[PDB]
Amino acid sequence: DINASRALANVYDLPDDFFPKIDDLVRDAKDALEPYWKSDSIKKHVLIATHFVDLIEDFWQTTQGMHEIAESLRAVIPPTTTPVPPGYLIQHEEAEEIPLGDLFKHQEERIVSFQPDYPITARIHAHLKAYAKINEESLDRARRLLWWHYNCLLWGEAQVTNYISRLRTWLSTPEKYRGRDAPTIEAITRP
Amino acid sequence: MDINASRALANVYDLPDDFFPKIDDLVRDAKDALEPYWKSDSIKKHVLIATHFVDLIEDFWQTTQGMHEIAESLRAVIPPTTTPVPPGYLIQHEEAEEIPLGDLFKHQEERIVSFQPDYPITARIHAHLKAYAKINEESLDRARRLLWWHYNCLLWGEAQVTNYISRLRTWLSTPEKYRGRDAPTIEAITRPI
Amino acid sequence: SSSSHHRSPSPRK
Amino acid sequence: DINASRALANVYDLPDDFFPKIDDLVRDAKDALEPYWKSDSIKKHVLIATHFVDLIEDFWQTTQGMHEIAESLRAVIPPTTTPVPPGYLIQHEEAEEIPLGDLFKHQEERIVSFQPDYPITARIHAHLKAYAKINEESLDRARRLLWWHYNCLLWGEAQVTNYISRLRTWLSTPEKYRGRDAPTIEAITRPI
Amino acid sequence: MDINASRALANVYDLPDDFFPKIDDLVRDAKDALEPYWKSDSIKKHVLIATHFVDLIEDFWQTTQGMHEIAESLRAVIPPTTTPVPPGYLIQHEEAEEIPLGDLFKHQEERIVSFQPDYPITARIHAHLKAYAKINEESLDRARRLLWWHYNCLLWGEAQVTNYISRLRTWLSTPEKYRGRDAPTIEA
Amino acid sequence: SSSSHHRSPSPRK
């Protein structure tokens, strides 16, 4: 639907701070999709949510670990080693262009193409950074889509896409003519 | 073929991992065969499932293989035979759910230190990377299996796919001498008009 | 009398 | 038909030894098509098959002669001249995207970008190898399509499709869940 | 003017080989006009034949012209005056269609050594390439003419294109003074 | 009366 796609894109663009803590998001999603699991239902939102939940719950911890590893490695690489410039590393598009696997060799020939003589301790840092970038992009997209599909399953597509729009508008406008407080789904707060 | 038994068998995970084709041509044929439903904007269950798993693989398999290769290149650098590799102390997929999302490296290095306080930073990195790569590889194997399953189902029906795998397993469990001179397949018929 | 495909796919035995 | 597209892809994906030799293929294709020519029919398979036969009869000889001329120039090339590596040899997709005319100049600038000065003989050798590669790709596609349409004409389309699917599946299995005998042409030979 | 005579005069191969358009423009126009029927997955006679000829044209022509320029370079760096080229001994398509599809090169070598058994390797190569170029060029000219024919037939119609071509020839025959400044067109 | 195409297209004279 056109309004649904509008809300979906506006979600994709959202400021990343209104999305709740991923931990509680996942906990509530896998606590609220349990009944449909027991009932074997196959609704669209149910499928997408119970799949992105598995994806996140499987690949978020390792990505955060990779980031921590890269941050620990930056401290131990020898100093003034001329860090790799941003944009030269393999990104998502050329990555998915590369066939499955055989990407480490491409990153390696790329890092040597910029600096033939580069310590392995920093080649590893660059590789980890470039991998975690892709992982985090995909996982953020998944988090967003999960929040959307889940809140839609809870309240209704045509009741959440009339909140995404109000929020987008109030969020673009400047502060003076937009009241003082943001809009919420009155069904949450109504006595 | 007692339909109940046939259904209770033929669970995808009951496959030796040699039957599935390579990931490359697997995803290739999956895309080339589900593109019609994509362009026609289908909503079918199996289509959705194959699409999700295809995106998952296409996004994360590259990075998992890269992490394996990084573990290798790093083992090529670690102090040789100066650091006994600790098994078991590292956490596999099962204990992952208990750990909150994020702060996994915290627990991992905490255990590594409880094992060897003087553990060199580099071998520490290698252990972390190998553990994470195993965690991802298990789930990617699962996703590959489910993708093959949902794809062959989209093609030939779950009633026929589960009836085929069932026959395949009870064939593999039949001695190579008395199996016969044929293998159970899935018929792909096209009668004329 | 189907298999225990709780979600759309089939889970472990 | 989606099944026809599947069959075309399957044909494009085959071991390249399952097909018969060009000589006998063209022989029996003409021997089975001549009557439709004399009767002035326009069946799709007839059209495609006769056009592909004309193509092959017109270009396979020249392609093979080109290969042999390359192998003969390799006897006069100065020794240990470092034959050009791939990547500096234009392939089919680049040949398709580059304008219809003046392909030799692009190949020349590419080989000189690889090595600034390069002997005329080895230049010729590389040019011929690339051109013959392109022609061979095209003629392989043509041979496959010709066998497909000719056997489709002589034994219907459905049976050929069934056989092709069965055989491609038999080939795409890891030798352990396959059998001990590949599906044989008798399948389409017989009626149904 | 009259239908039977117009139908018996119309034969693409009667054209002067210059009224035809440029190959690249022709191919571009044919591709752009077939794209719709392609996506519709039709089975029309003209569509099939035209797409086949277009594929042939975009794959062979490039290698054909390439071969020509290669032979030209070899002649430029051949023994300049010595080793005069063999006139007419080279085989054309009418003969090449007879030899098996494997060993045209052997028969060409036989012809060359028959004319002269003491002939340099590079001149040998240049001659072989020139002959192959002539063969492929004849075939590609036929292909171009058939492509133009079927393209315009698909666009307008065979009844119209035939009558049109008939008028074109009857205008080429007339003298430049008493003919029209311009040649006719389709849909007149 | 029509020039029946020997092959699918129009051949030479």
Residue numbers in the entry:
A (entry chain C): 2 to 192
B (entry chain D): 1 to 193
C (entry chain H), F (entry chain E): 250 to 262
D (entry chain B): 2 to 193
E (entry chain A): 1 to 188
Paper's wording?
Particularly striking is the much larger size (~260 amino acids) of their single capsid or core proteins (CPs) which in mammalian HBVs comprise only ~180 aa. In line with earlier data the major type of DHBc CLP conformed to the clustered-dimer T = 4 architecture known from HBc. Confirming selective aspects of evolutionary conservation between avi- and orthohepadnaviruses, the new data also reveal unique structural modules, including a direct contribution of the very C-terminal residues to the capsid shell and a centrally inserted extension of ~45 aa that behaves like an independent folding entity.
The 3D-map of the CLPs had a resolution of 3.7 Å, but more importantly, the extension domains were clearly visible at the same threshold as the core of the spikes, indicating that during long-term storage most extension domains had become folded. Local refinement of the orientations of these particles further improved the overall resolution of the asymmetric unit to a nominal resolution of 3 Å with the extension domains still less well resolved than the rest of the asymmetric unit. The core of the spikes was formed by four helices, with each DHBc monomer contributing an ascending helix (α3; residues 44–78, 35 aa) and a descending helix (α4; residues 120–157, 38 aa). Moreover, DHBc helices α3 and α4 were connected through a 41 aa long extension domain (residues 79–119) whereas in HBc this connection is just a short loop of 3–4 aa. The extension with two short helical segments (αe1: 92–99; αe2: 103–117), was positioned at the side of the spike close to α4 of the same subunit and in contact with α3 of the other subunit. As independently confirmed below, the packing of the extension domain to the flank of the spike was stabilized by a salt bridge between R124 in α4 of the core spike and E109 in αe2 of the extension domain. Analysis with Intersurf showed that the extension domain increased the inter-dimer surface area from ~1,900 Å² to ~3,400 Å², highlighting its important contribution to the intra-dimer contact. In DHBc the seven N-terminal residues pointed towards the lumen of the capsid, without contributing to the intra-dimer contact. The pockets at the base of the spikes close to the N-termini of chains A and D contained density that was not accounted for by the so far described model (f magenta).
